[PDB]
Amino acid sequence: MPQLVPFYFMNQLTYGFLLMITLLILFSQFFLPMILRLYVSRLFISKL
Amino acid sequence: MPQLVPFYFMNQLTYGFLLMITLLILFSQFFLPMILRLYVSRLFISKL
Amino acid sequence: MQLVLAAKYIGAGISTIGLLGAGIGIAIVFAALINGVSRNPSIKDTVFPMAILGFALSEATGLFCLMVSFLLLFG
Amino acid sequence: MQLVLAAKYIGAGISTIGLLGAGIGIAIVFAALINGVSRNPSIKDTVFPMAILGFALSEATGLFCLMVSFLLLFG
Amino acid sequence: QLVLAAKYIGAGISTIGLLGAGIGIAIVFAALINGVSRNPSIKDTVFPMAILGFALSEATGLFCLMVSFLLLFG
Amino acid sequence: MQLVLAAKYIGAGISTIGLLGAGIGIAIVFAALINGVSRNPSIKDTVFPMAILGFALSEATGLFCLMVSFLLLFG
Amino acid sequence: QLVLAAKYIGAGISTIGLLGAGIGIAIVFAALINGVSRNPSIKDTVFPMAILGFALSEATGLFCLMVSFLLLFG
Amino acid sequence: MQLVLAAKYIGAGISTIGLLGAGIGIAIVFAALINGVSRNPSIKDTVFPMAILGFALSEATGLFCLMVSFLLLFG
Amino acid sequence: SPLDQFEIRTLFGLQSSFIDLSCLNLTTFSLYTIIVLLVITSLYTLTNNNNKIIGSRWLISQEAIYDTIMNMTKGQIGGKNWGLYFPMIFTLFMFIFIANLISMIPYSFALSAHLVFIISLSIVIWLGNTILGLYKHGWVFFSLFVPAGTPLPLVPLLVIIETLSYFARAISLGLRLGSNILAGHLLMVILAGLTFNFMLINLFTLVFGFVPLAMILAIMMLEFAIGIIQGYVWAILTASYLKDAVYLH
Amino acid sequence: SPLDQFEIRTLFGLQSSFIDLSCLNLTTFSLYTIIVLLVITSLYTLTNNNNKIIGSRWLISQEAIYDTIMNMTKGQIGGKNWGLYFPMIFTLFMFIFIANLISMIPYSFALSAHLVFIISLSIVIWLGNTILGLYKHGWVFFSLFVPAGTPLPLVPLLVIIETLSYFARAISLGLRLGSNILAGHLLMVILAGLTFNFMLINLFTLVFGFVPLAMILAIMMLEFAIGIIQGYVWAILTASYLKDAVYLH
Amino acid sequence: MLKRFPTPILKVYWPFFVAGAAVYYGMSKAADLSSNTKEFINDPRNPRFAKGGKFVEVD
Amino acid sequence: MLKRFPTPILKVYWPFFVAGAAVYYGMSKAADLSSNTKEFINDPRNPRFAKGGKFVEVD
C-alpha cells in the first residue's frame, strides 16, 4: 500500500520510541505513584 | 554564467541587506563615536 | 500491463473469502460465552477476559487475510 | 483498460462470499441467546448486551468484506 | 510476464486456508469457556492446554500465510 | 548544436579586444600623473584622488567588455 | 537556428566600441591632471567640465553596450 | 565536436590582440617616467612607485585578456 | 483514493548537507505524538484538583483504568514479582487507548494505523521477551518449546511448529492492531464517500436519505468498541507473553 | 571548470511546507557575512585596550581608515551638511575592504564576486539618490540634466544622452567592482591550474619551475592592490553621486 | 564597554531604506520568474518541491 | 505539584531498550535499502537531494 511505505520510517519510529521512553519514565516515576499515594492515604485514614 | 545565477538570490540579498542595516546602525551609533570620543578627549587634554 | 493489474484485482478479490472463517469464529466464541453465563451466573467475571481474548485472538486470522488483500489492492 | 475493468467486476463478485460468515454468525449468537434465555429467564439484562456486542463484532467482519467489493466496483 | 501476474492469483488463493484457523481458535476457546462454566475449579489446570491448542492451530493456519508470502515476495 | 557553442566561443574571443582600450587608458592616466607630479612637486596630494578616480573609472569600460565575454563564455 | 548563433557574433563584435571610451576617459582625466598641475587654482573651476566630458564619453561608449545587450537579449 | 574545438582555437587566437594595449601601455608609463626624471631628478623616490603601480595596473588588463585565451585553449 | 487520510506531511522542517538530520522534524505523525503526550499529561496533572484526597469525578476514569489493568496483570503473570512489569503493561495500554480516541475525531489522523511503527513496537516487545528469557533462564529457556508430557517420537515436529508459532508472535501482535484500526477507518471513509454521491442525485434521495446516515452512525458507534477492545487485547497478549518468557510454562 | 570556487552550498538548513522560509538559512554566503560582521566587530571592540586614550598600535589602522574617509568625503560633498552622510560612506567602504581581504585567504570565498548582490546594492544606492534628490528639490531636480550655459538648439540631445548616462549609473557602479573581483580570482585560479599541470610532466620541469611560481606570487601581490583600490573607488563614486543628488551641480 | 550614542539614522537615510524595500520586492518577483525556466525547473533544491508540487518535467 | 519517586526503570527494562536499539538500527538499514528502489528514487523529498547527488533518473 502506497501510504504506509514512505521515506518517513525513521521519523515515525524516532518520535514513537521517544514517546515510549518518555511515557515509560513519566508514568512510572510520576503518575502511577501519585495514584498510589491516594491509595495509601485513604487506607491510612481508614486504619487510623 | 552558471554559478552566479542560482535560486539563492533572495538568500544573498537578505543576509546582505541585514548586514548593511546592521553595520549602518552598528557603525553609526557605536564605533565611529568611540573614535570621536578619543578625538575630543585628546583635544580637551590638549587645550586643558 | 493490463494483465498484471487484472490478476492483481482478482487475487485481491479471492483473498477476502477468509473472513467467513472469522465471522463464524466470533460467533462461536460469543455463543459459548452466552451458554456459559446462562448456565452459571457467577462465572461472568472470570470467563469474560477469556471471551475477549478468544474473540480478538481469533479475528486476527481473518485480518491477516485482509492484509494480504490490502497488499494486493494497493501494493 | 477494458480487461482491468472487467476484472474489477469479477473481484467485486468474489468479495461477496465473505458475507455468509456474518449470515451464519449473527444467527449463532442469537440462537445461543434464545437457548440461554430458555434455560434461565432471569439473566436477560446480563446476557443480552453480550449478544448485541457479538452481533456488532461479527457484522464488522461482514462489512470488512463488503468494503472490498465497494472498492472494486468504483474505486 | 504472465508469471508476475499469476503469482498474485496464487497469493490470493493460498490465503483461503485461514478459514480453518479462525473457526479453530473459536472451537478451542468455546470448549474452554464451556469447561470453565461447568467446572469452575479447572481454569488453572486446563488453560495451558487451551493456549497450546491455540498455538498449534494458528501455526497450522500460518502455513498458508507463509506460502502466500513466498508466492508474493519470492 | 555545435554551431551555437562554436559561434558562442568565437564571439567570446571577439569581445576581449576592448581591453586594449583600457590598457592604453590606465597608461595615459598614470602618464599624466607622472608628468604632473614631476613639474609640480606639491600637487601630489591634490592630484592623486583624481588619478585613482580616472584610473578605475576608465577601466570600467574594459571590464564591461570582459563581462560581455563572460556572459558569452559561461552563459 | 543560425540566427541564435549569429546574434552572439554580433554581440561580440558590437562590444569593440568601448575601445574608444576607455581611451577617451583617459584623455579627459589626463588633460584634467595637466591643467591642475600647471594652474593649481583651477580645480574647482574646471572639474565639472571634466565630469561632464566623462559622462558624455561614457554614454557614447555605452551605445555599443546597449546594442550588444539588445543583440544578446532581444 | 570538431567544430567547437576548431572554434576554440580561433577564439584563443582572437583573444591575443588585447595584449597590444599593455604593450603600448607599460611603455607610455615608463616613457613618462623618463621624461619626468629628466625634468626633475630629485623627485625619483616619489614618482617611481607610481610608475610601478601603473605598470601593475596595466599588466592586469593584459593578463585579463591572456586568461580568456588560456580558457579557450584548454578549459 | 479513499486512503488519502493517512498522508504524512512535513510541517516545521529541518535539513542540512553535513548530516542527515531529516530523521527528527515536526511532522503530522510527530505533532499527533505531541498531542497524545499532552493529553496523557492532561489526564493526570490538572485532573487532580489541588492534590485532594477525595479524587474528583475526572479522577474516577484514571482510577478505573489503573484498577482494571492492575487486576488484569495480576491474573496473568501473577508470580513472586508481577509489579515490576506493571508500568510497561500500563503504558502500552494508554498510548493505544488515547491514540484510538483521538483518531475518531473527524478531521484527524490515526497513529495506530501505521504498520511500520506498530510492527516495530511488536518486534521490540518480542526481542525484549527473548533476551529477558535467555538472561533469566540460561540454556533451559528452550524448555518452553516442549509442551508437557508428550511421546518422544513426535517431539521434534512439536518443537518445529512450536518455534514457528513462537516467531510468528513477533509480527502477529502488531498486525492485529494495525489491521483493525486501518480497516475501521477505511470502512468509514468509503461509506461516507458512497453516501455523499448517493445524496447528490435527484432531490427524492435527500428525502429518506436518513437511513444510510443512520448506518454510518451505527458504524461509528461500533468503531469506538473496536478501538478500545484492541487497546485491551494488546495489553492482555503482552501480559501472557511475559508469563511465558519469565516463567517457564 | 575553474569557476567552482564560487559555489554556494547550504549548511544549516531550514524548510517548511506552509511558508517559503528558505530565504533565510545559514549558507556559505551567509556564513561569510557572519564572519565579515565578526571581523569588523573585532577591529574595534577588543582592539581598544580597556578604553585607553593613547590608542594602541592596532587602533592606528582604524584611525587611518577613518581619517582617510573623512578627508575624502569632506572634499566631495563638502557643503553645509556633509557629515550627515558619513556613516553610509564609511560602511560602504569597510564591507568591501574586509570582504576583499577575507577572499584572498586561499580556501575561502568572495562575497564581492556575486553580481546579484553587488548590482542590487548599486541599484539601492541609485534609487536612494533619485528619491532623495526629488524629495529635497522638487520639480527642479531635473535641472541636473542640463550642464551649463549651452546653446538651446542642441539642449534636448544633451538631455537625452545625459539621462542615459544617469541611469547607466545604476549598474555601472556595481558591475565595476564585480568585474574586478571576479576577473582577479578567476585569473589566479586559472594560472594555478596551468602551473600545476606544468609541474607534473617529466622531472626536469620541477627544476627551474620556480619562475611560474614567482609569476603567481607577483599576481597575488597585484591582487591586494586591485582589491583595496576598488574598495576606495566605490566610496569615491558614491560620494560624487551624493554631491550631484544633494546639490544641483 | 561601549556607550550607545543616539545618532539620527532614520530622519537621514529613509530613501535608502525605501529603495531597499523596492529592490527587495522586485528581486523577489525576478527570482520567482527565473526559478521556473527550462534550465532550472529540475534542480531539486528549489523551494517548489518543499511545498506540494512535483516534477512538471515536460520540456 | 508532583513529587518524583525514584522507581527502578533501568535494572528491570534493559532488554526492551537493547531490542529498541537493535530494531532502530535494523530499520535504519531497511529504510536506506528501500529509499533507493525504482519507484522511489525520484521522489524529491528523500534526504539524498539535501546532500550532494542529483537525479540518477535512468530506469
UniProtKB/Swiss-Prot annotation, chains A, B:
The chain crosses the membrane at residues 13-32. Keywords: ATP synthesis, CF(0), Hydrogen ion transport, Ion transport, Membrane, Mitochondrion, Transmembrane, Transmembrane helix, Transport. Pfam families: Fun_ATP-synt_8 (PF05933). Disulfide bonds: none annotated. It is a single-pass membrane protein. GO terms for molecular function: proton transmembrane transporter activity. F-type ATPases have 2 components, CF(1) - the catalytic core - and CF(0) - the membrane proton channel. In yeast, the dimeric form of ATP synthase consists of 17 polypeptides: alpha, beta, gamma, delta, epsilon, 4 (B), 5 (OSCP), 6 (A), 8, 9 (C), d, E (Tim11), f, g, h, i/j and k. It comes from Saccharomyces cerevisiae (strain ATCC 204508 / S288c). This is ATP synthase protein 8. GO terms for biological process: proton motive force-driven ATP synthesis. The keyword Transmembrane applies. Mitochondrial membrane ATP synthase (F(1)F(0) ATP synthase or Complex V) produces ATP from ADP in the presence of a proton gradient across the membrane which is generated by electron transport complexes of the respiratory chain. F-type ATPases consist of two structural domains, F(1) - containing the extramembraneous catalytic core and F(0) - containing the membrane proton channel, linked together by a central stalk and a peripheral stalk. During catalysis, ATP synthesis in the catalytic domain of F(1) is coupled via a rotary mechanism of the central stalk subunits to proton translocation. It is found in: Mitochondrion membrane.
From Swiss-Prot, chains C, D, F, H:
The chain crosses the membrane at residues 14-34, 52-72. It is found in: Mitochondrion membrane. It holds the Pfam family ATP-synt_C. GO terms for cellular component: cytosol; mitochondrial inner membrane; mitochondrial intermembrane space; mitochondrion; proton-transporting ATP synthase complex; proton-transporting two-sector ATPase complex, proton-transporting domain. GO terms for molecular function: identical protein binding; lipid binding; proton transmembrane transporter activity. Disulfide bonds: none annotated. The keyword Ion transport applies. Keywords: CF(0), Formylation, Hydrogen ion transport, Ion transport, Lipid-binding, Membrane, Mitochondrion, Transmembrane, Transmembrane helix, Transport. It is a multi-pass membrane protein. GO terms for biological process: proton motive force-driven ATP synthesis. PROSITE patterns: ATPASE_C. The modification N-formylmethionine is found at residue 1. The record marks 59 as: Reversibly protonated during proton transport. F-type ATPases have 2 components, CF(1) - the catalytic core - and CF(0) - the membrane proton channel. In yeast, the dimeric form of ATP synthase consists of 17 polypeptides: alpha, beta, gamma, delta, epsilon, 4 (B), 5 (OSCP), 6 (A), 8, 9 (C), d, E (Tim11), f, g, h, i/j and k. Belongs to the ATPase C chain family. This is ATP synthase subunit 9, mitochondrial. The gene is OLI1.
Swiss-Prot record, chains I, J:
It comes from the Eukaryota. The keyword Transmembrane applies. The chain crosses the membrane at residues 26-46, 82-102, 115-135, 140-160, 181-201, 206-226. The keyword Membrane applies. It is found in: Mitochondrion inner membrane. SUPFAM superfamilies: F1F0 ATP synthase subunit A. It is a multi-pass membrane protein. Keywords: ATP synthesis, CF(0), Hydrogen ion transport, Ion transport, Membrane, Mitochondrion, Mitochondrion inner membrane, Transmembrane, Transmembrane helix, Transport. GO terms for cellular component: mitochondrial inner membrane; mitochondrion; proton-transporting ATP synthase complex. It holds the Pfam family ATP-synt_A. InterPro entries: ATP_synth_F0_asu (IPR000568), ATP_synth_F0_asu_AS (IPR023011), ATP_synth_F0_asu_bact/mt (IPR045083), F0_ATP_A_sf (IPR035908). One of its GO terms (molecular function) is proton transmembrane transporter activity. GO terms for biological process: proton motive force-driven ATP synthesis. Mitochondrial membrane ATP synthase (F(1)F(0) ATP synthase or Complex V) produces ATP from ADP in the presence of a proton gradient across the membrane which is generated by electron transport complexes of the respiratory chain. F-type ATPases consist of two structural domains, F(1) - containing the extramembraneous catalytic core and F(0) - containing the membrane proton channel, linked together by a central stalk and a peripheral stalk. During catalysis, ATP synthesis in the catalytic domain of F(1) is coupled via a rotary mechanism of the central stalk subunits to proton translocation. Belongs to the ATPase A chain family. The gene is ATP6.
From Swiss-Prot, chains K, L:
Its main location: mitochondrion. GO terms for molecular function: proton transmembrane transporter activity. Keywords: ATP synthesis, CF(0), Hydrogen ion transport, Ion transport, Membrane, Mitochondrion, Transmembrane, Transmembrane helix, Transport. It is a single-pass membrane protein. It comes from the Eukaryota. GO terms for biological process: mitochondrial proton-transporting ATP synthase complex assembly; protein-containing complex assembly; proton motive force-driven ATP synthesis. Pfam families: ATP-synt_J. The keyword Transmembrane helix applies. GO terms for cellular component: mitochondrial inner membrane; mitochondrion; proton-transporting ATP synthase complex. It is found in: Mitochondrion membrane. The chain crosses the membrane at residues 9-25. Mitochondrial membrane ATP synthase (F(1)F(0) ATP synthase or Complex V) produces ATP from ADP in the presence of a proton gradient across the membrane which is generated by electron transport complexes of the respiratory chain. F-type ATPases consist of two structural domains, F(1) - containing the extramembraneous catalytic core and F(0) - containing the membrane proton channel, linked together by a central stalk and a peripheral stalk. During catalysis, ATP synthesis in the catalytic domain of F(1) is coupled via a rotary mechanism of the central stalk subunits to proton translocation. Present with 6540 molecules/cell in log phase SD medium. Belongs to the ATPase j subunit family. This is ATP synthase subunit J, mitochondrial.
